[model samples]
Target chain A: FVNQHLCGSHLVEALYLVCGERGFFYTPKT
Target chain B: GIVEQCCTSICSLYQLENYCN
Candidate 1:
């Protein structure tokens, strides 16, 4: 499911899944 | 449960962007 943020979209909510389940999120900041 | 491997780099960044400000 798409993550619904407290402040915005593109956020992870109550859904629970594993790394091998189907892949998770993120990269970069510099 | 809906899941996908997409837009994560910017997605999470935007999430944090929302979280902080």
Candidate 2:
């Protein structure tokens, strides 16, 4: 199961690298 | 499932950390 937090150990970080500040998965103060 | 797979696919191709870790 994929989650924005606590699901994948580093998924959030990884997503932050790729999807962050893009369009949809924009995360502030990541 | 799509987003996970999408992320997973990119993770695989890019050799970045992933859920499977």
Candidate 3:
């Protein structure tokens, strides 16, 4: 999966991608 | 699952949203 998108993001940034972006698990943009 | 403990943990997470906004 896209580890860099998650592991690379700050905790808050990562949460935003998941909780706010509606991905809930993945960020394909990364 | 420790749903009870997470009640506080989940609630506090929004505390960070205050700063993020």
Candidate 4:
């Protein structure tokens, strides 16, 4: 099965545990 | 593999971060 829009939410929320909700920093483009 | 593709579809740094690492 494919993931829904909520799927990324889960992924992002998990990252919040490790990195943080600091959705201000930059990431990769490749 | 699929997850990586999902990250691509989502196209968000956060999604990539979650899987890429």
lDDT per residue, candidate 4, B1-21, as tens digits?
324444455444444454433
True contacts kept of 1: 0.00
**TM-score quality measure for candidate 2:** 0.31
Q: Rank the candidates by DockQ, best first.
A: 4, 1, 2, 3
- For A8-28, candidate 4 gives per-residue lDDT tens digits of 456455445545454422232
User: Lowest lDDT 10-mer window, candidate 4 chain A?
Assistant: A21-30
Output the better candidate (2/4) by lDDT. Answer: 4
Candidate 3 Cα deviation (angstroms), residue B10: 19
Give one digit per residue, the lDDT tens place, for model 1 in A1-30. Answer: 433322223333321222334444433232
lDDT of 2 by residue, A1-30 (tens): 223332243655555555445522422222
Which residue pairs collide in model 3, if any?
none
Computed on C-alphas against the true complex, the DockQ of each candidate is 0.08, 0.05, 0.03, 0.17
Q: Give the poorly placed runs of model 2, Cα more than 4 Å off.
A: A1-7, A23-30, B2-21
Flag clash pairs in model 2.
Answer: none
Clashing pairs in 4: none
lDDT string, candidate 3, B1-21, tens digits: 112222223323443233232
Q: Tell me the deviation in Å of residue A19 in model 3.
A: 0.3
Chain A of candidate 3 gets a TM-score of 0.34
Per-residue lDDT of candidate 3, residues A1-30 (tens digit): 113322324443644643563433323232
Q: Which stretches of candidate 1 lie over 4 Å from their true place?
A: A1-30, B1-11
